[PDB]
C-alpha cells in the first residue's frame, strides 16, 4: 500500500483583471482533500474531504496564511516571467506548480516532486536527487542560476523529506478507511448492429476507483491494436470512473472474442464475452 500527496497550484492573469487569481488544491492518494481560492469572498483553505474536518482552527489559519504567501510569490514570479520572455501587456498568462511526495508501502519517502510550468509548458523542475534543477528554456536559465545561487533546492528538499512526509503520515492516519479502499470494476459487453454482416462489441468497465485501468480484446490470444476503439477514462461524477473499448466483429463469428479488464482492485484480471 503506497501513498502520495500533491499540491497543485495555479496563478492566472487575464488582460484586464488587475491582479492574478491564485488557486491551490491538495491531494492525498490522488484525491482532493484541501483547496484554496483567492476569488472566494473570504479566501481560506477549506476541507474537501470529511476526514479533514478533524483539523482544528489553527491548522486552517496557518495554511491560509501560507496560501497568502504563495499568492504573493506567484504574483511576483508572473511579473518576472513576463519580462524574461519579453511579453507585452495585454495577454493572459499562467504559472503552475506541482509539489509533493511519494511513499512506499513501508511509508518511507520514495521520491519528492517540485515542478513548475509557464503558459502550460515545463519551465523548471527539481531533479529526483532533490539537489539539481532542470530548465530547458533559454529564458528559464535566469531562474535556474538565481535558485542555484540562493540554495533554493536544499530548502525544498527539507520541505519534501520532512514536512511533506510527516504531514502525509498524519493525514493517512486521520482518514484510514477513506483512502485504504479501491472499488473493483463491474464489466459487461454490449452489442450494436453495424454495416452488413458486422457488429460492434463494446466492453464496459463501470464503478471503479482509482481511475487507472486497462481494457483489451483478444481473438483467442491475440491482442488488438488494430483500430480497436476506446474512450478516455472519465468520472461517473459520484467518485468512480467509466471506460469502454469496442471492436468490429463478423456477425456470427462473434463468440471468438474475449475482453479483459486490468485493475488494481481486482483479485485478478477479468475475462468477459458476449
Amino acid at each position: 500500500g503506497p501513498h502520495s500527496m500533491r499540491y497543485f497550484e495555479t496563478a492566472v492573469s487575464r488582460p484586464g483583471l488587475e491582479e492574478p487569481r491564485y488557486i491551490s488544491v491538495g491531494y492525498v492518494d490522488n484525491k482532493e482533500f484541501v483547496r484554496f481560492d483567492s476569488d472566494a469572498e473570504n479566501p481560506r483553505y477549506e476541507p474537501r474531504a470529511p476526514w479533514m474536518e478533524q483539523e482544528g482552527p489553527e491548522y486552517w489559519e496557518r495554511e491560509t496564511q501560507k496560501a497568502k504567501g504563495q499568492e504573493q510569490w506567484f504574483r511576483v514570479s508572473l511579473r518576472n516571467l513576463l519580462g524574461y520572455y519579453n511579453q507585452s501587456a495585454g495577454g493572459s498568462h499562467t504559472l503552475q506548480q506541482m509539489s509533493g511526495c511519494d511513499l512506499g508501502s513501508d511509508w518511507r519517502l520514495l521520491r519528492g516532486y517540485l515542478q513548475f510550468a509557464y503558459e502550460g509548458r515545463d519551465y523548471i523542475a527539481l531533479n529526483e536527487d532533490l539537489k539539481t534543477w532542470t530548465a530547458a528554456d533559454m529564458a528559464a536559465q535566469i531562474t535556474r542560476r538565481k535558485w542555484e545561487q540562493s540554495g533554493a533546492a536544499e530548502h525544498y528538499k527539507a520541505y519534501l523529506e520532512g514536512e511533506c512526509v510527516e504531514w502525509l503520515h498524519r493525514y493517512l492516519k486521520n482518514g484510514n478507511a477513506t483512502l485504504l479502499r479501491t472499488d473493483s470494476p463491474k464489466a459487461h459487453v454490449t452489442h450494436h448492429p453495424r454495416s452488413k454482416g458486422e457488429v460492434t462489441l463494446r466492453c464496459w468497465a463501470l464503478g471503479f476507483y482509482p481511475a487507472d485501468i486497462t481494457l483489451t480484446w483478444q481473438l483467442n490470444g491475440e491482442e488488438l491494436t488494430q483500430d480497436m476503439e476506446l474512450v478516455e477514462t472519465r468520472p461517473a461524477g459520484d467518485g468512480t470512473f467509466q471506460k469502454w473499448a469496442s471492436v468490429v466483429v463478423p456477425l456470427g463469428k462473434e463468440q471468438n472474442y474475449t475482453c479483459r479488464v486490468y485493475h488494481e482492485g481486482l483479485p485478478e484480471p477479468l475475462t468477459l464475452r458476449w
Partner: peptide, 9 residues
C-alpha cells in the same frame, strides 16, 4: 500541508 516557496522566479 503544501510548500512554502523560496526565491521567486
Amino acid at each position: 500541508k503544501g510548500p512554502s516557496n523560496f526565491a521567486t522566479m
